[PDB]
Structure 1
Amino acid sequence: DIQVQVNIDDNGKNFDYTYTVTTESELQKVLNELMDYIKKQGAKRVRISITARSSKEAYKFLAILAKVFAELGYNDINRKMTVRFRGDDLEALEKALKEMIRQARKFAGTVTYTLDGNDLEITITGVPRQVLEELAKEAERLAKEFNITITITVTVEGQL
């Protein structure tokens, strides 16, 4: 139902906790576990993605994420979202890519994208939470339009 990768790097200590929480009641638990950990041991660098399937879900998740890093006292924050489109007609896939990169760049946004046979990935950097959210509605209406599969991972790394 919902993917979670998490990375702590410390030089000498590293960790790649990787989850699938299905309820998302779960999700708060595991987020919570992690935090009690860093309050203790204290990490140098953390990164956390949470994968979604809906524009609405995307909203929840960076918010949830924001709360986390915020509680963590991590102000040197670094966002990112990687939209994933899936569909057989490679035409409409591209049509989406164009339109998607457009809007990402209508703001100060830097994209990378890869298309590897009917799977098109589009990463997106250098924007506020406010943009990402608005860029994800756009991701979702695009999916709906040409009836392609969408996914929206919401990364957010941060050091301190």
Structure 2
Amino acid sequence: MHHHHHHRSGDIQVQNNNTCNGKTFDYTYTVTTESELQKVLNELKDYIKKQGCKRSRTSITARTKKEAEKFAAILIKVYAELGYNDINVTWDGDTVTVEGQLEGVD
């Protein structure tokens, strides 16, 4: 097979938008391989902690809802390191939109 990197294949567009957003340049990273996705979440998590009073939103381009599940398991994990292990997720299919839980427990 002809192996190549062309922006037209399974390009995964990760977009994070922060509530209490300070110096938030873009938080947008497009990875064709999940090996690179690891570094996205390493730096991203660190920032969301500062640019985020309680939570920030994320939406990742999943080409299948099967992928949306495992990127959800990653985003839930990332915000679980920041605070609450329970995180808010919605599986669309073309996208997985994950935002951290608001402090509401009794």
TM-score > 0.5, shorter chain as reference: yes
Amino acid of the structure 1 residue aligned with 2:95: T
CA distance in 1: counterparts of 2:92 and 2:61, whole angstroms = 9
Per the TM alignment, residue 42 of structure 1 is displaced from its structure 2 partner at its CA by 5.3
**Partner residue, 1:20:** 30
**Structure 2 unmatched runs, 5+:** 1-10
Greater length-normalized contact order (CA 8 Å, ≥ 6 residues apart)? 1
Amino acid of the structure 1 residue aligned with 2:80: A
CA distance in 2: counterparts of 1:79 and 1:36, whole angstroms = 20
| Partners of 1:7 and 1:14 within 8 A in 2 | no
| Partners of 1:58 and 1:153 within 8 A in 2 | yes
Matched, 1:153 2:95: yes
Per the TM alignment, residue 68 of structure 1 is displaced from its structure 2 partner at its CA by 1.0
Q: What does the per-residue CA deviation read over 1:65-98, in whole Å, with 9 as the maximum and x for residues that have no partner? A: 1111111113563222334xxxxxxxxxxxxxxx
Please state which structure has a larger fraction of its residues in strand.
Answer: 1
Per the TM alignment, residue 19 of structure 1 is displaced from its structure 2 partner at its CA by 1.7
Q: What does the per-residue CA deviation read over 1:3-48, in whole Å, with 9 as the maximum and x for residues that have no partner? A: 101011216x263422211112111101110122345x35223111
CA distance in 2: counterparts of 1:55 and 1:79, whole angstroms = 13
Could you list the runs of 4 or more consecutive aligned residues of structure 1 that deviate by over 6 angstroms after TM superposition? none
If you compute each CA radius of gyration, which structure gives the higher value, 1 or 2? Answer: 1
Taking structure 1 as the reference length, what is the TM-score of the superposition? 0.48
**Structure 1 unmatched runs, 5+:** 84-151
2:87 is paired with a residue whose SS is: strand
Aligned identity (percent) is: 69
User: Structure 1's 4 and 63: CA in aligned 2 closer, same or farther, altered over 3 A?
Assistant: same
User: Structure 1's 33 and 48: CA in aligned 2 closer, same or farther, altered over 3 A?
Assistant: same
CA distance in 2: counterparts of 1:4 and 1:58, whole angstroms = 12
**Partner residue, 2:78:** 68
| Partners of 1:81 and 1:153 within 8 A in 2 | yes
Please state which structure has a larger fraction of its residues in helix.
Answer: 1
